[PDB]
Amino acid sequence: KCKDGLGEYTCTSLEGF
Amino acid sequence: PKLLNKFDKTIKAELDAAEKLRKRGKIEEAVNAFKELVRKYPQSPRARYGKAQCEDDLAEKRRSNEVLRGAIETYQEVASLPDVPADLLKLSLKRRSDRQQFLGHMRGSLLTLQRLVQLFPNDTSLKNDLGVGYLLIGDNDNAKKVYEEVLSVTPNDGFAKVHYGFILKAQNKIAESIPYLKEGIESGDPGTDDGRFYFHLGDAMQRVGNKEAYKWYELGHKRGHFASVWQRSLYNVNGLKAQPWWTPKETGYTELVKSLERNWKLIRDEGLAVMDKAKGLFLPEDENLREKGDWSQFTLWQQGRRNENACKGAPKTCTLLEKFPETTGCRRGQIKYSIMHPGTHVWPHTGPTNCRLRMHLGLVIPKEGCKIRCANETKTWEEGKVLIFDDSFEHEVWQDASSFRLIFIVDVWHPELTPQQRRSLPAI
Ligand SMILES: O=C(O)CCC(=O)C(=O)O
Ligand SMILES: [Fe+3]
């Protein structure tokens, strides 16, 4: 997860519509 | 695209008729036309693909996960038919993978992508997409092995270069990542003009000392990736007031600030009790943001969710904070204690979103050696006082005191966010 920084390829999760 | 096999060529008239309805927006009509084509011609791959494309369009129209799940199955059915043209085969499984990812079936997308690579071992682009699959589930090791295969066959692939450099940088091979990121962005290949690769290239240069990092931040600002050279968050909402330092009155959260400052010793004492009697609850910082030193965090809320076991250790603080949904409900922020020891230096960095403001409440502040820069201004903490900054701007921290420094971090929604956005924004 991206808490203090921006280290992940994506910071959100996908859950459809 | 060559989509019609031998048999489908003999029925192009019926297939083209059905597709025209889809292009005309008669989605419910086209599904029934393609359904009847699949019933009449159960082995036709074009008819089966048409049914999936129609189920796909219908899933968008209704915003239905169940309908999309059915389209995902029909896309696979196309690949199980006999004599499917290779172009139709790629398109049907690539789209299946995409929609599986859109639903969060990341493990299912990976299986589809692996099948594509087994079916077409010479397609570089499918390997590149498999590497993205591994990155989406966080498997940087397998992602790295994929892009190494690509860079062996096509060594000038810009997409492979940036993603290889991203993985290196994430594995803390800072110096080694730089040529892969710079050469990918400059290749101009599709997929290389992405803020993520500008972000990490400039950060990698900043860490190693190269003063040209600013130029890459500026180029990312010119190409619409960063709101400025200084504010480089990537999950943004446009228009929000943008300034590095805020006063309590400017935020409008004056009740929260007053509560924090009136009750600061209680917050301090519960944090010290955890340091003394439950030190294991403080977890080391895990985002590779430190050059050197010791920095640990004890989190009470994350993504708008209360940590029940953590609040057992600071129960009065958690009771106090429950009155302020502007921070407990901030799904793009945290509430946490943060301890830093002498000899710590945090690299310049930004947070991921402009949708939050970050409050710091000083709890135990050594009288010398602790400071925080944000943009072009450096400030210090005061015990029992709140500092507010926008951590989407570049900021940097030093701890060169003779004892520990403890603060309380309270993230709030950016005040200009509407209530509608506060409930719909994906959590971060
Ligand atoms: O000083 C601290 O405890 C953390 C500094 C920081 O980078 C932040 O609060 O985002
Ligand atoms: Fe930070």
| Among B253, B183, B230, CA closest to B392 | B230
B175 and B292 inside one domain:
no
Domain of residue B396 covers 248-424
Residues 6+ apart with CB under 8 A from B199: A6, B220, B225, B226, B232, B234
B162 and B262 inside one domain:
no
B353 and B417 inside one domain:
yes
Chain breaks in chain A (C to N over 2.5 A) after: none
B197 and B328 inside one domain:
no
Report the half-sphere exposure of B193 (CA within 13 A, side-chain side).
9
- Give the closest-approach CA distance of B16 to chain A in angstroms: 30
- Give the closest-approach CA distance of A1 to chain B in angstroms: 7
Q: Which of B65, B285, B352 sits opposite A6 (nearest CB)?
A: B352
C-alpha distance from residue B323 to each of B6, B300, B312 (Å) = 69, 15, 17
Residues 6+ apart with CB under 8 A from B168: B176, B177, B180
Contact A11 B428 (CB under 8 A): yes
The token pair that represents B185 in the structure block: 């962005």
Say how far apart CA B63 and CA B147 lie, in whole Å. 35
Which residues in chain B touch residue A7, judged by CB atoms under 8 angstroms apart? 170, 287-288
Is residue B414 assigned to a domain? yes
What is the phi-psi region of residue B418: left when phi exceeds 0, alpha when psi lies from -120 to 50, beta otherwise? beta
Secondary structure, 3-state, chain B? CCCCCHHHHCCHHHHHHHHHHHHCCCHHHHHHHHHHHHHHCCCCHHHHHHHHHHHHHHHHHHCCHHHHHHHHHHHHHHHHCCCCCHHHHHHHHHHHHHHHHHCCCHHHHHHHHHHHHHHCCCCHHHHHHHHHHHHHCCCHHHHHHHHHHHHHHCCCCHHHHHHHHHHHHHCCCHHHHHHHHHHHHHHCCCCCCCHHHHHHHHHHHHHHCCCCHHHHHHHHHHCCCCCCCCECCCECCCCCCCCCEECHHHHCCHHHHHHHHHCHHHHHHHHHHHHHHCHHHCEECCCCCEEECCEEEEEEEECCEECHHHHHHCHHHHHHHCCCHHHHCCCCCEEEEEEECCCEEEEEECCCECCEEEEEEEEECCCCCEEEEECCEEECCCECCEEEECCCECEEEEECCCCCEEEEEEEEECCCCCHHHHHHCCCC
B212 and B256 inside one domain:
no
* Torsions phi, psi for B36 (to 5 deg): -65, -30
Is residue B148 assigned to a domain? yes
Strand partners, B295: B340
B301 and B203 inside one domain:
no
Residues 6+ apart with CB under 8 A from B284: B294, B295, B296
| Among B206, B129, B141, CA closest to B171 | B141
Residues 6+ apart with CB under 8 A from B361: B260, B261, B264, B267, B384, B385, B386, B407, B408, B409, B410
Say how far apart CA B199 and CA B216 lie, in whole Å. 8
For residues B97 and B72, is the Cβ–Cβ distance under 8 A?
Answer: no
| Among B127, B139, B132, B204, CA closest to B165 | B204
Query: Cα of B318 to ligand 2 centre, how many Å?
Result: 23
Residue type, B167: I
Is residue B154 assigned to a domain? yes
The alpha carbon of B152 is separated from its chain's Cα centroid by a whole number of angstroms, namely 29
For residues B357 and B390, is the Cβ–Cβ distance under 8 A?
Answer: yes
| Among B316, B228, B221, CA closest to B273 | B316
B208 and B258 inside one domain:
no
* Torsions phi, psi for B197 (to 5 deg): -80, -30
Length in residues, chain B: 428
Experimentally, the structure was elucidated by X-ray
Is residue B368 assigned to a domain? yes
Report the half-sphere exposure of B423 (CA within 13 A, side-chain side).
2
Q: Hunting for tokens 């003063």 — which residue is that?
A: B211
C-alpha distance from residue B21 to each of B64, B72, B105, B279, B298 (Å) = 21, 21, 30, 66, 58
B265 and B170 inside one domain:
no
Whether residue B363 has its Cβ less than 6 Å from ligand 1? no
Is residue B164 assigned to a domain? yes
For residues B157 and B165, is the Cβ–Cβ distance under 8 A?
Answer: no
- Count other Cβ atoms within 10 Å, centred on residue B275: 17
B263 and B209 inside one domain:
no
Which residues in chain B touch residue A9, judged by CB atoms under 8 angstroms apart? 135-136, 138, 166, 196
Q: What is the DSSP letter of A9?
A: S
Is residue B242 assigned to a domain? no
- Provide the CATH number for the domain around residue B81: 1.25.40.10
Is residue B231 assigned to a domain? no
Is residue B228 assigned to a domain? no
Q: Which value in Å is the resolution of this experimental model?
A: 1.9
For residues B409 and B387, is the Cβ–Cβ distance under 8 A?
Answer: no
> What does the radius of gyration of chain B's CA atoms come to, in whole angstroms?
27
Instruction: Give B223-228 contacts, CB < 8 A, sequence gap 24+.
Output: B223/B193, B223/B198, B225/B194, B225/B195, B225/B198, B225/B199, B226/B195, B226/B198, B226/B199, B227/B354
Q: How many domains does chain B have?
A: 2
Say how far apart CA A11 and CA A13 lie, in whole Å. 7
Tell me if chain A has a CB within 8 Å of the CB of B192. no
Q: Give the residue on B whose Cα is nearest the Cα of A6.
A: B352
Q: What is the DSSP letter of A13?
A: -
B159 and B104 inside one domain:
yes
For residues B68 and B40, is the Cβ–Cβ distance under 8 A?
Answer: no
Q: Among B207, B223, B239, which residue terminates a domain? A: B223
B380 and B282 inside one domain:
yes
> Atom 1, ligand 1: which residue's CA is nearest?
B397
Whether residue B146 has its Cβ less than 6 Å from ligand 1? no
